[PDB]
């Protein structure tokens, strides 16, 4: 392999008494707007390069799953109010009150057969479903349908959160987070605030109504064009491709990019965006952008993508990576 050959030509470890035992280091900065997948990528490195999340570990995310599920339904229900959507059947209006009763009597997340029923009944409602369907009009968790559609499982008294349940979580993170993991004998120090940068973009934020997509481009623009990053490999993750795919079906790219004239198909719309971002590169002859369409919650896609991102690093940056 080319990266194999590429690695094989280094001679620096011969300069270290016991160099074949040294740690070659890769410093990787993870960037992108809020809620764009940075934390999910951090979790996936654990899942893929460590063990990630043990059932004991997943057990700790139970009240986070409950918490996320409760918030999601409450957000759709409160929205119907502002948007004026009726309940498909007005008996549901009582479950709506009960949701606030049960949620209102608690500090932290929980699930009860009673709460489980109220939420299921509401979720199955057509009017609620109609409001759900207008999610671009209000703030709603991306994992909402994920969690809501799997309530019973989640509702089970002896429920243990799966790795996917854990990856689907929205957890409030503050501070810099630093993860160390080894892959292909490279020791990565990854910082979710430099050898490479992975910039995440939530593709589905396009129809959300400055514009979200445009604030991300705004930031990408500055990032890749920064002098500090001149020798850093700029990787662009056009993430949430899974939510974008279903969304582009009924929503139009023009909501985001009004001048867009291509077909509103996943192919043309996603291609358009990639072009929009890479177009920001002010040194196109000097710098290349490595774009990947990702689903951060899909461990296989990330494994795939990361393997690829990794070979680019070896081929472009190994020489600047120090031995420790």
Q: Which amino acids are annotated as binding site for Mg(2+), given as ranges?
A: 39, 173
Yes or no: say if 35 and 170 are a contact pair by the CB < 8 Å rule: yes
Helix and strand element counts for the chain (H, E): 14, 6
Known binding positions for GTP? 35-40, 142-143, 167-170, 192-193, 239-242, 296
b/e burial code for range 240-251 (CB count within 10 A of at least 16 → b): bbbbbbebbeeb
Yes or no: say if 170 and 297 are a contact pair by the CB < 8 Å rule: no
* The one segment of 4-12, 37-45, 113-121, 268-276 that binds ligand GDP by CB under 6 A: 37-45
268 vs 261: CA distance, rounded Å: 10
Per rule CB under 6 A, is residue 69 in the interface with ligand GDP?
no
Strand-pairing partners, residue 187, are: 25, 182
> Closest by alpha carbon to 194, among 236, 226, 231, 237?
231
Per rule CB under 6 A, is residue 72 in the interface with ligand GDP?
no
Yes or no: say if 120 and 69 are a contact pair by the CB < 8 Å rule: no
E strand or H helix that includes residue 243: helix 241-250
Quick note: the x/- pattern for ligand GDP over 176-205, rule CB under 6 A, is ------------------------x-----
Which segments of 154-260 are extended strands (E)? 177-183, 186-192, 196-202, 233-239
Quick note: the x/- pattern for ligand GDP over 124-143, rule CB under 6 A, is ------------------xx
Per rule CB under 6 A, is residue 40 in the interface with ligand GDP?
yes
Per rule CB under 6 A, is residue 58 in the interface with ligand GDP?
no
Per rule CB under 6 A, is residue 86 in the interface with ligand GDP?
no
Per rule CB under 6 A, is residue 243 in the interface with ligand GDP?
yes
Choice from 45, 295, 309, 313 touching ligand GDP (CB under 6 A): 295
Yes or no: say if 45 and 190 are a contact pair by the CB < 8 Å rule: yes
Choice from 24, 38, 62, 121 touching ligand GDP (CB under 6 A): 38
Choice from 13, 49, 134, 170 touching ligand GDP (CB under 6 A): 170
What is the nearest approach in angstroms of ligand GDP to the Cβ of residue 146?
A: 7
Nearer to ligand GDP, 145 or 321 (CB): 145
* The one segment of 18-26, 55-63, 217-225, 291-299 that binds ligand GDP by CB under 6 A: 291-299
> Closest by alpha carbon to 201, among 212, 211, 191, 209?
212
Which structure tokens are listed for 32?
């992108």
Yes or no: say if 197 and 31 are a contact pair by the CB < 8 Å rule: yes
Quick note: the x/- pattern for ligand GDP over 247-286, rule CB under 6 A, is ----------------------------------------
E strand or H helix that includes residue 31: strand 24-32
Choice from 36, 98, 179, 281 touching ligand GDP (CB under 6 A): 36
Judged by the rule CB under 6 A, the positions of this chain that interact with ligand GDP are: 32, 34-40, 142-143, 167-170, 200, 239-240, 242-243, 294-297
């Amino acid at each position: 392999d080319k990266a194999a050959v590429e690695r094989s030509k280094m001679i620096d470890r011969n300069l270290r008494e016991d160099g074949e035992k040294a740690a070659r280091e890769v410093k990787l900065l993870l960037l992108g707007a809020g809620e764009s997948g940075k934390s999910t990528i951090v979790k996936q490195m654990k899942i893929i390069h460590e063990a990630g999340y043990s059932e004991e570990e997943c057990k700790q995310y139970k009240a986070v799953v409950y918490s996320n599920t409760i918030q999601s339904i409450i957000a759709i229900i409160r929205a119907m109010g502002r948007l004026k959507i009726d309940f498909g059947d007005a008996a549901r209006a009582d479950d709506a009150r009960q949701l606030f009763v049960l949620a209102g009597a608690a500090e932290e997340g929980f699930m009860t057969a009673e709460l489980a029923g109220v939420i299921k009944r509401l979720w199955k409602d057509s009017g609620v479903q109609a409001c759900f369907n207008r999610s671009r009009e209000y703030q709603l968790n991306d994992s909402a349908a994920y969690y809501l559609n799997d309530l019973d499982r989640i509702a089970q008294p002896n429920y243990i959160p799966t790795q996917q349940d854990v990856l689907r979580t929205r957890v409030k993170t503050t501070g810099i987070v630093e993860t160390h993991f080894t892959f292909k004998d490279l020791h990565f120090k990854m910082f979710d605030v430099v050898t490479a940068i992975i910039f995440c973009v939530a593709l589905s934020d396009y129809d959300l109504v400055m514009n979200r997509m445009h604030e991300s481009m705004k930031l990408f623009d500055s990032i890749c064009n920064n002098k500090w990053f001149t020798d850093t490999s700029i990787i662009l993750f056009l993430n949430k491709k899974d939510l974008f795919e279903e969304k582009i079906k009924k929503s139009p790219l023009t909501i985001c990019y009004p001048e867009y004239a291509g077909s509103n198909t996943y192919e043309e719309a996603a291609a358009y965006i990639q072009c929009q971002f890479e177009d920001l590169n002010k040194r196109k002859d000097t710098k290349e952008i490595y774009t990947h369409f990702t689903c951060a919650t899909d461990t296989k896609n990330v494994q795939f993508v990361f393997d690829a991102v990794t070979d680019v690093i070896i081929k472009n940056n190994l020489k600047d990576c120090g031995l420790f």
